[PDB]
Amino acid sequence: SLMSCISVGTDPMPIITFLSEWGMEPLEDYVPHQSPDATRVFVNGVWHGVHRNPARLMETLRTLRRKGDINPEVSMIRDIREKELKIFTDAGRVYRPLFIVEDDESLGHKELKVRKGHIAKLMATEYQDDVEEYTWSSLLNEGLVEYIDAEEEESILIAMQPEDLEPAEVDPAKRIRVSHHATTFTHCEIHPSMILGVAASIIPFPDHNQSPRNTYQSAMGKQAMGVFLTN
Amino acid sequence: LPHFSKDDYSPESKGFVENSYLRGLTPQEFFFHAMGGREGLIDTAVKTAETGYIQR
Amino acid sequence: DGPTMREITETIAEAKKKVLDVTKEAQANLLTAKHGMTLRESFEDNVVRFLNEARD
Amino acid sequence: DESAPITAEDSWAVISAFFREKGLVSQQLDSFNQFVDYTLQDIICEDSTLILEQLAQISRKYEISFGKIYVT
Amino acid sequence: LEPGHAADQEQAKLIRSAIEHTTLKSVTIASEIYYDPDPRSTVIPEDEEIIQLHFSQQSPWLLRLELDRAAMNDKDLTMGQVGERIKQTFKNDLFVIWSE
Amino acid sequence: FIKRDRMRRNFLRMREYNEFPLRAIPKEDLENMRTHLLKFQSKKKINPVTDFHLPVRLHRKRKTRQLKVLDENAKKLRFEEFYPWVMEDFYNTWVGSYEAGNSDSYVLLSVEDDGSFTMIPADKVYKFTARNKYATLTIDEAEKRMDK
Amino acid sequence: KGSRFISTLQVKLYGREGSSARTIKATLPYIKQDIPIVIIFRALGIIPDGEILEHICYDVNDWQMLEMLKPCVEDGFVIQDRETALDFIGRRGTALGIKKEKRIQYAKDILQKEFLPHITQLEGFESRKAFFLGYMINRLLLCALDRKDQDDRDHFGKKRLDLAGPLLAQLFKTLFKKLTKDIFRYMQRTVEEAHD
Amino acid sequence: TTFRFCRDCNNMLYPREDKENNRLLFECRTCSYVEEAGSPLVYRHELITNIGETAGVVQDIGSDPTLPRSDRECPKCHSRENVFFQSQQRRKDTSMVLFFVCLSCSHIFTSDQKNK
Amino acid sequence: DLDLERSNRQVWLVRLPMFLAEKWRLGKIRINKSKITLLLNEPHEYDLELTKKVVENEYVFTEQTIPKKTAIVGTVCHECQVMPYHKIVEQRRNIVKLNNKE
Ligand SMILES: [Zn+2]
Ligand SMILES: [Zn+2]
Structure with missing residues (x-):
């Protein structure tokens, strides 16, 4: 799809070394009787220890990755019910970005961490074409947008579009949607239309078509005839 | 889909497209419909290879 | 026209009720899996039945 | 105000940022770039040496090293 | 069904039961093995009330197992057959009592 | 209903205690003494070899030119001792085993004759396990029995 | 590695x-x-x-x-x-x-x-x-x-995509052994006969 | 059920029948340790089960975002904030009853009507 | 020939971060009651952690079917983990992810 990228892989050592000095007791000292409730900890499918207070551990790594010291490719999944915490720095994973919903507010409810302020700071940079250089990266380092792989995706609850879904609580020609009954969103999609690849991003109103019809055009358009390069 | 909470058997959760091609499909419906639509393509591919061998 | 689209919207909405009910009956363990299918399957067929009668 | 929650239109500014930075063939480039920077060197140095010893009446031994790597 | 017995649910039910295969492991809840040594007295309270109840040689290891009703009452059955089935199964080396 | 590419107008026209000093402990001792660790894994509440037996004994129990594999020394060393550490009578018994999980981040402050400590990191750590508490085995017959 | x-x-x-x-x-x-x-x-x-x-x-x-x-x-x-x-x-x-x-x-x-x-x-x-x-x-x-x-088995979480990085690596690595092996052999055979 | 292990041997104690005192003892086929039978029942087989219906209910089940909330009030807490989920017995014949969990008392209840 | 010398010293094991480990390849135990502290030689006042009080079947031993000169020095009395004061520590521990090669 358009937004999706693919990890290049990093070194797991810093994370492990970090995990050690944050409560992960090594495996050699593990005795399931005394630690009936510990959480296993994996790093690329290597059991590395257990942890006894993983909830505090998780949210530490997250902000440590939202700060930008854990390279944001890195996926970290806490599987509460299986008592497991998994981390991959593996190369080759497929991931896409998402807005972070912080259920924090003086507004007293959840809302995206990115506001008109940053939007302005962005459009200022595009129309630069005097430097404050708000780029994509700044949205990363400020903990506004996260990469999410497909495994980590299991443990989030994405909102579909901010407006229609974050604030709590009609044209009959308009299509019919359902509600924000879910109150625990932890992410919002940047734009739902970004689930389409390149070829299908040229169909107009692909949501008014029969599905195979979009597969056809998406394969014909490759044998249209245009200008292929200006030179 | 990761847009739903768990154990959600409502019609729109398990794949009931409700709008009409005129009104447009919401992004989930779109994806469920595309999932059903792909299964149609594969069958066609299969149903003609296996037909072709039978008839010969 | 407008009047029609309303009834379609209603007719769809009833199905959700009929589906909801079967969900509650199933989740109160009040159901009756007709011999020859577990409670799951019985639950599914009913749903798909209503959801298909609704479209038609 | 500069803290009002954004609206669905505002996304496309975010998306512009993404592509203004990542392009569309990023993954093709990013991986290759990684290979040239690191994975090349580390391929070399995983077997940086190979030896050979002959025994005399004292044993002569030879071994060859592999150091930095340079790409023009 | 038989030509006369067309559309008599009852008569149909009897046939359905007549051919539908039924193994024990489809009616029983769980099997327990004890060591209740005396053949006559049983450490389990109820088994006594039936030990004499049919006592009025044998190993000290009670094998006892428990069936659902609704299962056993779906393709409904009487343990009187079920027992004699076991009785007819191996021998009369395996003494068997069953609840009513 | 349209796409408005002139927005770049507005966005252009809008913007007690026991304190103890510790010093450069002699090295020649350490040049010959190696201070390892040890753990018994029998759950035996205390299991000190004070009650083990006497005496106690802790110890371990043509061609042309060629190229060989290459390997760092420590592994070459660590490998080249496949005789484990043992304790016995002449008959209770234990057997040692390398651990290697946490050989590093462990310096030791043994309560010496005084409360102070010379500075000592552990060389290695060993898992010591009992043996022959029932002393049964069919090392030969095992295959024979497991194939009846 | x-x-x-x-x-x-x-x-x-x-x-x-x-x-x-x-x-x-x-x-x-x-x-x-x-x-x-x-x-x-x-x-x-x-x-x-x-x-x-x-x-x-x-x-x-x-x-x-x-x-x-x-x-x-x-x-x-x-x-x-x-x-x-x-x-x-x-x-x-x-x-x-x-x-x-x-x-x-x-x-x-x-x-x-x-x-x-x-x-x-x-x-x-x-x-x-x-x-x-x-x-x-x-x-x-x-x-x-x-x-x-x-x-x-189709859960996309468990797949991986080898892009040009990996694919070259897997390839180049083997091509690099072959280079050593030959060097060694030549290195051997020249020492085998004390050739210059 | 309820396996027993030896001590100073730590293997698992098979039952060895005492006929003379006429009761059941647990041997240890490696070291000769023995003891009684704390209950004459020896073995269970458990065809149709009702466990795992609460698999891994940890004190954090309230902290999982993806779990559907619900409003019903706990019989104990009479608080009306509870997560819920189907029976974790991932098997086909399994019913579709609901296990709630109140975020306050961590008490588990069920949506049932046939049997509570 | 092995010798159980005394094996009664109340050795206290400590787990420490690397920056500590490197620095160890004096002290001032300022314990207080059970909020045990200690002053390190300059550096900080890093307290001890009651990481594991009870430690059985664990003893220190040193050496010099080959035999060797065994000596059983002391027993683990309790296991400790380093309590890094935290200002620069987290400032560098987080910054432990700020290194690479060329
Ligand atoms: Zn034993
Ligand atoms: Zn409650």
Whole structure:
């Protein structure tokens, strides 16, 4: 799809070394009787220890990755019910970005961490074409947008579009949607239309078509005839 | 889909497209419909290879 | 026209009720899996039945 | 105000940022770039040496090293 | 069904039961093995009330197992057959009592 | 209903205690003494070899030119001792085993004759396990029995 | 880091459900048979089954799982010794290295180097590999007890995409060996004849 | 059920029948340790089960975002904030009853009507 | 020939971060009641952690069918983990992810 990228892989050592000095007791000292409730900890499918207070551990790594010291490719999944915490720095994973919903507010409810302020700071940079250089990266380092792989995706609850879904609580020609009954969103999609690849991003109103019809055009358009390069 | 909470058997959760091609499909419906639509393509591919061998 | 689209919207909405009910009956363990299918399957067929009668 | 929650239109500014930075063939480039920077060197140095010893009446031994790597 | 017995649910039910295969492991809840040594007295309270109840040689290891009703009452059955089935199964080396 | 590419107008026209000093402990001792660790894994509440037996004994129990594999020394060393550490009578018994999980981040402050400590990191750590508490085995017959 | 090894452990559960002899064996590499697990643990040095069971059932309440394990416990009963264990395995794969003292040793080395070549290949980690082989076993049991669904093979979370980075790596790596090998051979053969 | 292990042997104690005192003892086929039978029941088989219906209910089940909330009030807490989920017995014949969990008392209840 | 010398010293094991480990390849135990502290030689006042009080079947031993000169020095009395004061520590511990090669 358009937004999706693919990890290049990093070194797991810093994370492990970090995990050690944050409560992960090594495996050699593990005795399931005394630690009936510990959480296993994996790093690329290597059991590395257990942890006894993983909830505090998780949210530490997250902000440590939202700060930008854990390279944001890195996926970290806490599987509460299986008592497991998994981390991959593996190369080759497929991931896409998402807005972070912080259920924090003086507004007293959840809302995206990115506001008109940053939007302005962005459009200022595009129309630069005097430097404050708000780029994509700044949205990363400020903990506004996260990469999410497909495994980590299991443990989030994405909102579909901010407006229609974050604030709590009609044209009959308009299509019919359902509600924000879910109150625990932890992410919002940047734009739902970004689930389409390149070829299908040229169909107009692909949501008014029969599905195979979009597969056809998406394969014909490759044998249209245009200008292929200006030179 | 990761847009739903768990154990959600409502019609729109398990794949009931409700709008009409005129009104447009919401992004989930779109994806469920595309999932059903792909299964149609594969069958066609299969149903003609296996037909072709039978008839010969 | 407008009047029609309303009834379609209603007719769809009833199905959700009929589906909801079967969900509650199933989740109160009040159901009756007709011999020859577990409670799951019985639950599914009913749903798909209503959801298909609704479209038609 | 500069803290009002954004609206669905505002996304496309975010998306512009993404592509203004990542392009569309990023993954093709990013991986290759990684290979040239690191994975090349580390391929070399995983077997940086190979030896050979002959025994005399004292044993002569030879071994060859592999150091930095340079790409023009 | 038989030509006369067309559309008599009852008569149909009897046939359905007549051919539908039924193994024990489809009616029983769980099997327990004890060591209740005396053949006559049983450490389990109820088994006594039936030990004499049919006592009025044998190993000290009670094998006892428990069936659902609704299962056993779906393709409904009487343990009187079920027992004699076991009785007819191996021998009369395996003494068997069953609840009513 | 349209796409408005002139927005770049507005966005252009809008913007007690026991304190103890510790010093450069002699090295020649350490040049010959190696201070390892040890753990018994029998759950035996205390299991000190004070009650083990006497005496106690802790110890371990043509061609042309060629190229060989290459390997760092420590592994070459660590490998080249496949005789484990043992304790016995002449008959209770234990057997040692390398651990290697946490050989590093462990310096030791043994309560010496005084409360102070010379500075000592552990060389290695060993898992010591009992043996022959029932002393049964069919090392030969095992295959024979497991194939009846 | 090196050769991207392809060792592939498996923990096969035996006999269908309802059958008895539901015993559990594993298939180490270079071992021509598949070894009952209670052995492999002992080979790593976890003798008292009450431990072996604790490497597998991290919730002592769960007696289902234990029941499934007992027919494995009893299968290993003949062995109580680590070195016999190690010996037992050594019997079973590529017996060219006839040195008996080194037989069990080579078995002791196949574990160390060839058995879960991820979690490690250094010396002295069998406590680690032991728990893992427990975990791998435990997950097997959840499935045969219907406590978890079978695994899903299309879950895109478990795929990976090799882009031009990896694909060149895999390629270039082999092409680099071939370069050494030849250099070495030439290096050899020239020294073989003391050629300039 | 309820396996027993030896001590100073730590293996598991099979039952060895005492006929003379006429009761059941648990041997240890490796070291000769013995003891009684704390109950004459020896073995269970458990065809149709009702466990795992609460698999892994940890004190954090309230902290999982993806779990559907619900409003019903706990019989104990009479608080009206509870997460819920189907029976974790991932098997086909399994019913579709609901296990709630109140975020306050961590008490588990069920949506049932056939049997509570 | 092995010798159980005394094996009664109340050795206290400590787990420490690497920056500590490197620095160790004096002290001032300022314990207080059970909020045990200690002053390190300059550096900080890093307290001890009651990481594991009870430690059985664990003893220190040193050495110099080959035998060797065994000596059983002391027993683990309790296991400790380093309590890094935290200002620069987290400032560098987080910054432990700020290194690479060329
Ligand atoms: Zn015993
Ligand atoms: Zn409650």
